[PDB]
Design a protein around this ligand. Structure first.
Ligand SMILES: *[C@@H]1O[C@H](CO)[C@@H](O[C@@H]2O[C@H](CO)[C@@H](O[C@@H]3O[C@H](CO[C@H]4O[C@H](CO)[C@@H](O)[C@H](O)[C@@H]4O)[C@@H](O)[C@H](O[C@H]4O[C@H](CO)[C@@H](O)[C@H](O)[C@@H]4O)[C@@H]3O)[C@H](O)[C@H]2NC(C)=O)[C@H](O)[C@H]1NC(C)=O
Ligand SMILES: *[C@@H]1O[C@H](CO)[C@@H](O[C@@H]2O[C@H](CO)[C@@H](O[C@@H]3O[C@H](CO[C@H]4O[C@H](CO)[C@@H](O)[C@H](O)[C@@H]4O)[C@@H](O)[C@H](O[C@H]4O[C@H](CO)[C@@H](O)[C@H](O)[C@@H]4O)[C@@H]3O)[C@H](O)[C@H]2NC(C)=O)[C@H](O)[C@H]1NC(C)=O
Ligand SMILES: *[C@@H]1O[C@H](CO)[C@@H](O[C@@H]2O[C@H](CO)[C@@H](O[C@@H]3O[C@H](CO[C@H]4O[C@H](CO)[C@@H](O)[C@H](O)[C@@H]4O)[C@@H](O)[C@H](O[C@H]4O[C@H](CO)[C@@H](O)[C@H](O)[C@@H]4O)[C@@H]3O)[C@H](O)[C@H]2NC(C)=O)[C@H](O)[C@H]1NC(C)=O
Ligand SMILES: *[C@@H]1O[C@H](CO)[C@@H](O[C@@H]2O[C@H](CO)[C@@H](O[C@@H]3O[C@H](CO[C@H]4O[C@H](CO)[C@@H](O)[C@H](O)[C@@H]4O)[C@@H](O)[C@H](O[C@H]4O[C@H](CO)[C@@H](O)[C@H](O)[C@@H]4O)[C@@H]3O)[C@H](O)[C@H]2NC(C)=O)[C@H](O)[C@H]1NC(C)=O
Ligand SMILES: *[C@@H]1O[C@H](CO)[C@@H](O[C@@H]2O[C@H](CO)[C@@H](O[C@@H]3O[C@H](CO)[C@@H](O)[C@H](O[C@H]4O[C@H](CO)[C@@H](O)[C@H](O)[C@@H]4O)[C@@H]3O)[C@H](O)[C@H]2NC(C)=O)[C@H](O)[C@H]1NC(C)=O
Ligand SMILES: *[C@@H]1O[C@H](CO)[C@@H](O[C@@H]2O[C@H](CO)[C@@H](O[C@@H]3O[C@H](CO)[C@@H](O)[C@H](O[C@H]4O[C@H](CO)[C@@H](O)[C@H](O)[C@@H]4O)[C@@H]3O)[C@H](O)[C@H]2NC(C)=O)[C@H](O)[C@H]1NC(C)=O
Ligand SMILES: *[C@@H]1O[C@H](CO)[C@@H](O[C@@H]2O[C@H](CO)[C@@H](O[C@@H]3O[C@H](CO)[C@@H](O)[C@H](O[C@H]4O[C@H](CO)[C@@H](O)[C@H](O)[C@@H]4O)[C@@H]3O)[C@H](O)[C@H]2NC(C)=O)[C@H](O)[C@H]1NC(C)=O
Ligand SMILES: *[C@@H]1O[C@H](CO)[C@@H](O[C@@H]2O[C@H](CO)[C@@H](O[C@@H]3O[C@H](CO)[C@@H](O)[C@H](O[C@H]4O[C@H](CO)[C@@H](O)[C@H](O)[C@@H]4O)[C@@H]3O)[C@H](O)[C@H]2NC(C)=O)[C@H](O)[C@H]1NC(C)=O
Ligand code: NAG
Ligand code: NAG
Ligand code: NAG
Ligand code: NAG
Ligand code: NAG
Ligand code: NAG
Ligand code: NAG
Ligand code: NAG
Ligand code: CA
Ligand code: CA
Ligand code: CA
Ligand code: CA
Ligand code: MN
Ligand code: MN
Ligand code: MN
Ligand code: MN
Lengths: 244, 244, 244, 246
């Protein structure tokens, strides 16, 4: 509650402390696969979500304290066709009872089913969007991007990101509550490249007192499929008290 | 999984990260009450259990790694009648799907319903037994005690403990896996007294790979009731890898 | 040794756990001032260095283990004249017995006194260079930059950085040893801007087994002076063992 | 300062982050030896002290905040003659500039040189005293003990302790500042035995704002020598802020 820190360097099949929604699963080799894979090939129209079992406490209505946190993970996106990719994944905080919305949720990364932004969603996400289509995703920019989503698919702030096929990406997301700042960074040590972005968000009005952290991913047409994988994931959060 | 640490200095009503079984609840003042209390008075035949939402990983069958951990909490036992008290409470590790056994479970601290020890229980507990009755609890010693229970109410090792009515007790439980040692200590800073005990247990054969940690408490006849309360609770565990 | 973590949210005068070289000092208000300030005005030709008292263990020659670490701090650079600024500061790892080189060390940020790179220096730094002069600093680029220095002032990799006068900057430096990667990030939450850079370095050949971490800063001519301040600083490092 | 945590599972020769006073040293095998050992035999009249390089912040005079901390370590005491042992060792907090007092400091575990208690010492120690002599140590009880020392060799509180020759002991010392309580526990997993003690101390009046943590050990006559060794040592302290005073 006040403080919560965990680290998962490797995953196991049917992991107990992870709640899976959709078709997400963990392979025998120990890699967390949000999209089902048959004989080394990704499938089409596959949506997956994983969450940590324990809800995370963000703020208190009585005292007014608000939590600042930081997390880091390693993920891989590998597509048979480098030219075009489908949708992508995201790291998101949602209500504990959040479930997959009904209907077509591919272009929304399995988080929403409507393009409009509503304050009732109470979802705060950092998306790694690899699909820059204009007809299906008019809101997204022309290039592959890393964006911050607050109660809507239309990201308040995005940064151009150069995706590498079969490349391990080390991502870090840090929220500073006193400064009301969300920072997302991604690093490719294979080419030694960095992409960073920051935004101004206040979790008091957006998210409830208790939330759940996790990952989401989606896929589209069979021709433009891809594989999303997570190898490690570390999280730490503390609820500092304000006497003011 | 590999590492998990949390700290709860204060509790809130309907806490999300705590699973309650029986009649356990959290008061408005922020104290975790395993036994229901009416207008400042404990009730009779009340059994309560609380667990952490996230299961804890102890060991791996493939690598052979085993986790060592440590936890600390503060609890209060306050009875209207200091002469005689009912049952008591315990800090226990059990399977994630553990539920309250049917039948009379008061004298067993809400963990078992049979006096015999069976390896299928897979429950490892540290009990603070305040009831020294001989007819109902022939297994327990003549004095109030702190005991270690492994797959049975009959504690493998117990230490005499002087209970103080309305006294805050600071307890610490530490498991060292390489040495296969479980250590339980209790401190009263109001009188500056300490009671410690150690035992030899191996969680490989007893508990499964994934377990849940928490507290349990029970009460008996109305004349000899008592109030069990928990004010704070901190836990930390790491899964160190063995290359041997 | 194996693990070391500390956090200093506020500083105190004549702090015991900080070793000061040059004219660095801590103000009564609790801000770490590397450059001496008279009545709210910075001085000229002022060089300061601060280090943590405890040396940090990086690697072992026998086992071959190498440490990965992460640190974060907050710093402020405030100059009376926004047009031109002097030198700058840096976060550096050096030998425990490192001292200020003799001679003009202003343009070298108080770390070196020669422009050439020599492997005997054994200094690894992340510099926030605010002086883009060409005659005095031909090696530096045309713009204010954040650079990574390995045994020389000429940074192996630099990133353009927009300096803000009187603006609080939150910086984070993370070294991953298995991937041999050094990452430096800087954030301005007042304007919500981020600047990140990564480089490939191996501390085995560069630094010795035991090093000291800290900060350095320098100033130049009186007309182009500036004030360097540090408000908070957190560091954490672990020495993970490799069984390969 | 506000928070400081470190862990040393193994030691190395000439360790940089440890300050050694006296004849303490680290062996090639990686064990911290406070008393010099020749060819596997302890020596006589050997006094050693080790401290962590970084001073530890306990309290602030302005805000009034006071730090609570916890530490754990593993130590071995092995004597050729189990019948009688010399002096012992202790885990102590002292001023950063503390040095070995001049004169005979064997019976005082290398911390003091006078039996009387003076508030100017500013030393807070947890001693594992293995010498129960009455003529040389009239203050100590009749049995081997674990004691808490505050500005004096005469321990305010002691607990009987059964020493095991060549036995690994796991010790844990925890200070709770809001409750002003110091707790010391020792465990032998080889026989599964525990010895615990608690005392009431306030570091505000005793120790200064900045202190240094470490270990001390001493030896006596050649016939009753022993070897003191430390295998691992972990420390963690945090300075929690109190808004009641402010
Ligand atoms: C992220 O988080 C915080 C907010 O939570 C951001 O805001 C800064 O936080 C600091 C510390 O809380 C605050 O600094 C305050 O500045 C006040 C005014 O500054 C005086 O001193 C300077 C000295 O040069 C003068 O230039 C100036 O003219 C003023 O005279 C001070 O009054 C404050 O002191 C206070 O101390 C205690 C509380 O600790 C109070 O009880 C006192 O009454 C007193 O008021 C304090 O020093 C300030 O809110 C922000 N800093 C600024 C404006 O510089 C952080 O900026 C942000 N951190 C990041 C991004 O790293
Ligand atoms: C809790 O956990 C551990 C077990 O997990 C308990 O067991 C001790 O652990 C240590 C360290 O692993 C082991 O110590 C070993 O002792 C071996 C023999 O000792 C030699 O050296 C002494 C020096 O005085 C001589 O007296 C003696 O005659 C022997 O010559 C050594 O061989 C071991 O060294 C090994 O190092 C590496 C591994 O790190 C190996 O690759 C080498 O091949 C080499 O074998 C090692 O030093 C031993 O298992 C236990 N310690 C003993 C018996 O003293 C801990 O006791 C327990 N900790 C607690 C309760 O605090
Ligand atoms: C930062 O740090 C590490 C290096 O320290 C970087 O390197 C990766 O680290 C991982 C894990 O150590 C290594 O992955 C290895 O890949 C080997 C080959 O891959 C097989 O499996 C895939 C499955 O799709 C096939 O595609 C492929 O064709 C191969 O069949 C495996 O053999 C390795 O498994 C090993 O497991 C144990 C050790 O844990 C060994 O004992 C076994 O013998 C077995 O060899 C292992 O899975 C690999 O070194 C690097 N990953 C790669 C190449 O994908 C990290 O990339 C870097 N992390 C960042 C930047 O986040
Ligand atoms: C180690 O540390 C602390 C001291 O630092 C020791 O002292 C206890 O700490 C708690 C929490 O700070 C304090 O509890 C206080 O008790 C007050 C009175 O109790 C009322 O409620 C009970 C309910 O049964 C009634 O029985 C009783 O008659 C009273 O009606 C309360 O007033 C306090 O509430 C306060 O909350 C906030 C601060 O958080 C204040 O702003 C409010 O004004 C309000 O006063 C509070 O609940 C108390 O100091 C000590 N606990 C006691 C006496 O029970 C710890 O005991 C010690 N911990 C160990 C050894 O584990
Ligand atoms: C886009 O997403 C929204 C939100 O999901 C979606 O609106 C509704 O969401 C709910 C929850 O997923 C859908 O779930 C069920 O649909 C049927 C018919 O309602 C029933 O199984 C359930 O309805 C009963 O239970 C509700 C409990 O709140 C009651 O409110 C209700 O009165 C019924 O008793 C349950 O709602 C629901 O189907 C959709 N609504 C519709 C018309 O489908 C929205 O539909 C999505 N818009 C798209 C894809 O265009
Ligand atoms: C002491 O504790 C043991 C263990 O609880 C207890 O044995 C049985 O435990 C189960 C689980 O709590 C009891 O629960 C239910 O009882 C009835 C009748 O069986 C049904 O609701 C359920 O039985 C069905 O579901 C089971 C699923 O495994 C099937 O195995 C079974 O075939 C049925 O389909 C469920 O079991 C169960 O009642 C008790 N057994 C009895 C006779 O009560 C034991 O009874 C306790 N001994 C005491 C109090 O003396
Ligand atoms: C650029 O930096 C280098 C490295 O500092 C510098 O070379 C020498 O560095 C040392 C250490 O700071 C200087 O320090 C002293 O200088 C005088 C004369 O040597 C003496 O105080 C000392 O010399 C004695 O002690 C040394 C110990 O190693 C002995 O090696 C020596 O034989 C003497 O006994 C000590 O060295 C030293 O002055 C400089 N060398 C010179 C000529 O100044 C180098 O000078 C700098 N280059 C610049 C500014 O152009
Ligand atoms: C028991 O312990 C106390 C405390 O150590 C001891 O008193 C004195 O302690 C100091 C510090 O260890 C001893 O150190 C030196 O002794 C000589 C003579 O004084 C000098 O080297 C030094 O004295 C000079 O420096 C001092 C700095 O404070 C000045 O105060 C002084 O005026 C001198 O300029 C330094 O003190 C000191 O020797 C002892 N005092 C004596 C008489 O030895 C005490 O002696 C011990 N009692 C025993 C063993 O019975
Ligand atoms: C917080 O407390 C105030 C008390 O007036 C109440 O009005 C408000 O509804 C509460 N908000 C939440 C989310 O509980
Ligand atoms: C990264 O390095 C590899 C080396 O083979 C190279 O093939 C690839 O083109 C590089 N990618 C980028 C974006 O530089
Ligand atoms: C552990 O692995 C071995 C492989 O032979 C298997 O026999 C055993 O059943 C496994 N144990 C568990 C609890 O999975
Ligand atoms: C503890 O201290 C209080 C002080 O009032 C006293 O009443 C009580 O008897 C003491 N309890 C024990 C076991 O010493
Ligand atoms: C490391 O060990 C090898 C052993 O052959 C030795 O040659 C080498 O000099 C050592 N390196 C250092 C820096 O001690
Ligand atoms: C940052 O915000 C302030 C608001 O007053 C503005 O003055 C300043 O120009 C901004 N700086 C940048 C680089 O946008
Ligand atoms: C603490 O502050 C007060 C201010 O009046 C002062 O009198 C006292 O000497 C200070 N104590 C210490 C140890 O600095
Ligand atoms: C501890 O166990 C060993 C087993 O050999 C035994 O020799 C020794 O006497 C025991 N010590 C105590 C105090 O029980
Ligand atoms: Ca898209
Ligand atoms: Ca009983
Ligand atoms: Ca420059
Ligand atoms: Ca003695
Ligand atoms: Mn997008
Ligand atoms: Mn019992
Ligand atoms: Mn530069
Ligand atoms: Mn003694």
């Amino acid at each position: 509650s006040d403080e919560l820190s965990f680290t998962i360097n490797n995953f196991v099949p049917n992991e107990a402390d992870l709640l899976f929604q959709g078709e997400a699963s963990v392979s025998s080799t120990g890699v967390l696969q949000l999209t089902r894979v048959e004989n080394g090939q990704p499938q089409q129209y596959s949506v997956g979500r994983a969450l940590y079992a324990a809800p995370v406490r963000i703020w208190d209505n009585t005292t007014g304290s608000v939590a600042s946190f930081s997390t880091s993970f390693t993920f891989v996106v590998k597509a048979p066709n480098p030219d075009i990719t489908s949708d992508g994944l995201a790291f998101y905080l949602a209500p504990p009872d959040s479930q997959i919305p009904s209907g077509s949720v591919s272009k929304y990364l399995g988080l929403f089913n409507n393009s409009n932004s509503d304050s009732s969603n109470q979802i705060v996400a950092v998306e790694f969007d690899t699909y820059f289509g204009h007809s299906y995703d008019p809101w997204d920019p022309n290039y592959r991007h890393i964006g911050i989503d607050v109660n809507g698919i239309e990201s308040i702030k995005t940064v151009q990101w150069d995706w590498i096929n079969g490349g391990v990406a080390f991502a870090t997301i840090t929220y500073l509550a006193p400064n009301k700042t969300l920072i997302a960074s991604l690093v490719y040590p294979s080419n030694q490249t960095t992409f960073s972005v920051a935004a101004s968000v206040d979790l008091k009005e957006i998210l409830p007192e208790w939330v759940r952290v996790g990952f989401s991913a989606a896929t589209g047409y069979p021709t433009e499929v891809e594989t999303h994988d997570v190898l490690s994931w570390s999280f730490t959060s503390t609820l500092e008290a304000n006497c003011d």
